[PDB]
Design an enzyme around this catalytic site. Structure first.
Site, PDB file in Angstrom:
ATOM      1  CG  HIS A   1      -0.425   0.465   2.479  1.00  0.00           C
ATOM      2  ND1 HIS A   1      -0.117  -0.423   3.484  1.00  0.00           N
ATOM      3  CD2 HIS A   1      -0.162   1.701   2.978  1.00  0.00           C
ATOM      4  CE1 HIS A   1       0.310   0.241   4.548  1.00  0.00           C
ATOM      5  NE2 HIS A   1       0.293   1.537   4.269  1.00  0.00           N
TER       6      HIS A   1
ATOM      7  CG  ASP B   1      -0.166  -3.865   2.488  1.00  0.00           C
ATOM      8  OD1 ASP B   1      -0.317  -3.398   1.350  1.00  0.00           O
ATOM      9  OD2 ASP B   1       0.179  -3.179   3.480  1.00  0.00           O
TER      10      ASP B   1
ATOM     11  CB  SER C   1       2.911   1.035   6.190  1.00  0.00           C
ATOM     12  OG  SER C   1       1.652   1.272   6.788  1.00  0.00           O
TER      13      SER C   1
HETATM   14  C1  LIG Z   1       0.730   2.688   5.091  1.00  0.00           C
HETATM   15  C2  LIG Z   1       1.069   2.542   6.585  1.00  0.00           C
HETATM   16  O1  LIG Z   1       1.983   3.544   6.936  1.00  0.00           O
HETATM   17  C3  LIG Z   1      -0.153   2.584   7.532  1.00  0.00           C
HETATM   18  C4  LIG Z   1       0.210   2.183   8.979  1.00  0.00           C
HETATM   19  C5  LIG Z   1      -0.877   2.546  10.008  1.00  0.00           C
HETATM   20  C6  LIG Z   1      -0.545   2.014  11.411  1.00  0.00           C
HETATM   21  C7  LIG Z   1      -1.608   2.408  12.425  1.00  0.00           C
HETATM   22  N1  LIG Z   1      -1.424   1.810  13.734  1.00  0.00           N
HETATM   23  N2  LIG Z   1      -1.227   1.756   7.019  1.00  0.00           N
HETATM   24  S1  LIG Z   1      -2.735   2.281   6.779  1.00  0.00           S
HETATM   25  O2  LIG Z   1      -3.629   1.242   7.064  1.00  0.00           O
HETATM   26  O3  LIG Z   1      -2.928   3.493   7.512  1.00  0.00           O
HETATM   27  C8  LIG Z   1      -2.894   2.678   5.099  1.00  0.00           C
HETATM   28  C9  LIG Z   1      -3.349   1.614   4.178  1.00  0.00           C
HETATM   29  C10 LIG Z   1      -3.463   1.907   2.870  1.00  0.00           C
HETATM   30  C11 LIG Z   1      -3.179   3.290   2.377  1.00  0.00           C
HETATM   31  C12 LIG Z   1      -3.315   3.620   0.905  1.00  0.00           C
HETATM   32  C13 LIG Z   1      -2.803   4.244   3.239  1.00  0.00           C
HETATM   33  C14 LIG Z   1      -2.648   3.915   4.673  1.00  0.00           C
HETATM   34 CL   LIG Z   2      -5.008  -1.135   2.585  1.00  0.00          CL
END
Ligand SMILES: *C[C@@](*)(O)[C@H](CCCCN)NS(=O)(=O)c1ccc(C)cc1
Ligand SMILES: [Cl-]
Ligand SMILES: *C[C@@](*)(O)[C@H](CCCCN)NS(=O)(=O)c1ccc(C)cc1
Lengths: 264, 264
Positions: free
Chosen positions: B57, B113, B194
Site C-alpha cells: 500500500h 500487503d 507501514s
Molecule cells: C501505510 C502505513 O503507513 C499505515 C500504517 C498505520 C498504522 C496504524 N497503527 N497503514 S494504513 O492502514 O494506515 C494505510 C493503508 C493503505 C493506504 C493507501 C494508506 C494507509
Molecule cells: Cl489497505
C-alpha cells in the site's frame, strides 16, 4: 451469499431513490474466487465505455489478473429481508447468471486505493446496466449512499444522513479519503464491499470503498468507513496509468461533475 | 521527525536485545517525500543481496517509482527520550545523511500487503547494515517486537508481550495477517510505520506492517496492528513476481526459518 444481518437489501424501500445507480454496481471474482465490488462509471463523452471503478487493494492491477476476472450483474435478493433479522443474515437467493469475463487495467494508484478497469465485453442491453455520474469537486456533502456487495454477497444499500469529512485513511492527516458515518442501526459495509461506490445526494460517485471500522456490531465513531476520493484519484499519481482524468474526461471538456447514462 | 510521544526511541534500554535487527530497518521517500518504512532481509544464500521488504500500500510497485526512492539508514534520536514525555513527542535529532537511491521490484502482492524490492546499490560497509532472518512457519508466537519509523520519523521500537493471533486484515476471516497486541502504555505504530517488520522472539521477520487501529490513545483491542505474513507471502500470488520464495530461498534449500547476517 452471506453478509451481516443489519445490511439492507437493495430491493427494500431504502433503494427507492437509487433504482438507476443500483444497476451500476457489480460483484466480481478474481482468479475464480468471489472477491470485491466495483461499479460502472460514465465519462464526459457519454459513450458507454465499460469503465469499471474498484479498489486497488482488491489486486486487479495487472493485465493477467484482469483478463480472467468475472463480473456479475444484478446479484441481489429477490425480496426485502427485514434488516436485523435472521433472514437478512442468511444466504440470499441472488442469481449469478448475468456475467461477463475479462478486462484491462486503465489506471491504478495506492494513495486513494483506486483501480479503473475497462471491461472487455460491451454492455449487453438485456442486463439493463447504468453508467453512474461522478463529482470531482473538493467538498464534503450532507449525506451519501453506498451500494455494495458485502462479503461479495447479494447487493445492499447503506445510507449516511450526516456530513462527510475529508481525511487520510483511518482518520490520519490528509485529504485522500472521504469519511462516511453510518446510521446507528443502519447498513454498514464489510470485507468484499471494497471498491463499491459512495454516491453524493445527486447520485454521483465521490469515491470507492477502501475500508474502515464499521461492522453490524460497531458503535459510535467506529460505525464508519473511508472512501478513496474521486477528487484525489482524478490527478492521482500524475500519469495516465495512475489517475482518472484521461479516461473519465478523455476529450478535455473540463467537467467538474457529470450525470449518469442509462442503457436505455 | 515527529511521532506520538508514547513511542520508544530505539536507543532506549528497550532496544538492548535488538541491536542487530535495529540496523535492518530504514525509512524511505517516494517521489521525494518521506513515505514509509522497510527492512533488509537475509536469504538462504547469506549473500548480502539488498532485499528490502515493505508494504504494497506504500505504492512502490512500478519501476519508475522504485527507481527514484531514497532509503535512509540510521535515522534515530541520539538519546532516549522518556516515553510519554513532551520530549518524545517533539521533533527528534536524527540524521538523514546516510542514504542510497533506487530499487527494482522483485515481487508484490496485495493480499498480504507485501512488496519485496532489491535496492540498486550494494551495502556500504560504513552504514553497518544487518540482514534480518525470517520464519515462514504457520504459527503464532508468545510475543513480538516491531522496529519502525512512525510518521517516517526517527526509529522506534514497540514490544508485544502477549500472544499473536492469525486472521485476515482488521480481524476478518482469513489467515493472511498476524494480529499483534501492544502493551497498554507501550509503543504502538502510526501511519508511516507501514512496511516495518515484526520480529519473532528469535528476531526473525514474521511479516510487515499493513495497518490497524493502534495509536498512542488507543486502548484494549484497538491498541493493536496487523502484519501481512511471511507465511502467506511465501507462496503469495503463485508466481515469482507475486511471492517471496524465489528470492529469499533462490537456492532451494527448503529452509523454514533462517537467522540474520551481519555486515561484519
Ligand atoms: C501505510 C502505513 O503507513 C499505515 C500504517 C498505520 C498504522 C496504524 N497503527 N497503514 S494504513 O492502514 O494506515 C494505510 C493503508 C493503505 C493506504 C493507501 C494508506 C494507509
Ligand atoms: Cl489497505
Ligand atoms: C478490500 C475491502 O473489501 C475491505 C472493506 C472493509 C470494510 C469494513 N467496514 N477493505 S479492508 O480494509 O478490509 C482491506 C484492505 C486491504 C487488504 C489487502 C484487504 C482488506
Amino acid at each position: 451469499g452471506v453478509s451481516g444481518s443489519c445490511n439492507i437489501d437493495v430491493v427494500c424501500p431504502e433503494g427507492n431513490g437509487h433504482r438507476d445507480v443500483i444497476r451500476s454496481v457489480a460483484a466480481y471474482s478474481r482468479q475464480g474466487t468471489m472477491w470485491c465490488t466495483g461499479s460502472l462509471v460514465n465519462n464526459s463523452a457519454n459513450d458507454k465505455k465499460m469503465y469499471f471503478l474498484t479498489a486497488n487493494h482488491c489486486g486487479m492491477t495487472t493485465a493477467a489478473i484482469a483478463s480472467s476476472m468475472v463480473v456479475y450483474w444484478n446479484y441481489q435478493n429477490s425480496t426485502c429481508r427485514a434488516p436485523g433479522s435472521s433472514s437478512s443474515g442468511a444466504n440470499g437467493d441472488g442469481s449469478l447468471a448475468q456475467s461477463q469475463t475479462g478486462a484491462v487495467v486503465r489506471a491504478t494508484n495506492a494513495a486513494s486505493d483506486f483501480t479503473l478497469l475497462e471491461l472487455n465485453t460491451a454492455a449487453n442491453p438485456a442486463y439493463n446496466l447504468f453508467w453512474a455520474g461522478w463529482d470531482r469537486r473538493d467538498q464534503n456533502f450532507a449525506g451519501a449512499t453506498a451500494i455494495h456487495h458485502p462479503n461479495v454477497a447479494e447487493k445492499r444499500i447503506s445510507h449516511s444522513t450526516v456530513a462527510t469529512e475529508i481525511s487520510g485513511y483511518n482518520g490520519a492527516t490528509g485529504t485522500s479519503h472521504l469519511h462516511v458515518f453510518w446510521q446507528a442501526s443502519g447498513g454498514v459495509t464489510e470485507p468484499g464491499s471494497s471498491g463499491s461506490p459512495i454516491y453524493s445526494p445527486e447520485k454521483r460517485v465521490l469515491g470507492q470503498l477502501h475500508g474502515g471500522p464499521s461492522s453490524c456490531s460497531a458503535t459510535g465513531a467506529d460505525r464508519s468507513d473511508y472512501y478513496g476520493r474521486v477528487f484525489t484519484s482524478w490527478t492521482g499519481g500524475g500519469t495516465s496509468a495512475t489517475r482518472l482524468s484521461d479516461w473519465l474526461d478523455a476529450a478535455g471538456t473540463g467537467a467538474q461533475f457529470i450525470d449518469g447514462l442509462d442503457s436505455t
